[PDB]
Amino acid sequence: GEERKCLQTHRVTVHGVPGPEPFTVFTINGGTKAKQLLQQILTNEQDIKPVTTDYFLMEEKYFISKEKNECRKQPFQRAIGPEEEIMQILSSWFPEEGYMGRIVLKTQQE
Numbered sequence: 001g002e003e004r005k006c007l008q009t010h011r012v013t014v015h016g017v018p019g020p021e022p023f024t025v026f027t028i029n030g031g032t033k034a035k036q037l038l039q040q041i042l043t044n045e046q047d048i049k050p051v052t053t054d055y056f057l058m059e060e061k062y063f064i065s066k067e068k069n070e071c072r073k074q075p076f077q078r079a080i081g082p083e084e085e086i087m088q089i090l091s092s093w094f095p096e097e098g099y100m101g102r103i104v105l106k107t108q109q110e
Contacts, residue, residue: 005031012086014041014057016105018050023102028087035082041105054108056080059089061101079106 013025018041026040034057041057042050057080062070070076080086086103093101 008087010087010090012037012040012090012103014103014105016055016057016103017041031085032087033082033085034080037086038105055105056108057086058104058106059101060104061097064097064100 007030009027009029011025011027013023015023017024017026026037026043028037028040032040038055038057039052042052042055044050058077059080060077062076078084078089080089080103089103
């Protein structure tokens with residue numbers, strides 16, 4: 001109860017998981033960034049050492065200015081790198097947005 005910087009264990013629901021699930025959530029701890037987190041998503045929990053490849057995260061968002069699809073002619077989505085911590089993403093997640101958005105796990109292929 002004296003933790004000024006506690007072990008921030010949050011589970012982050014990932015949509016690009018290697019898991020059989022279509023979306024599954026892996027738990028983080030301390031101060032995991034997206035890199036340590038891509039790991040957490042990789043985390044086979046066995047030797048915990050999958051085939052950790054060119055995977056990365058993405059917040060796929062929109063403007064909430066219109067309905068259906070807000071013109072799929074503009075990449076309004078942020079690719080999550082290590083420096084850009086996911087907890088900052090969830091922190092920048094405005095209550096106004098609320099239900100719009102998701103963590104994707106892409107590959108470093110284009």
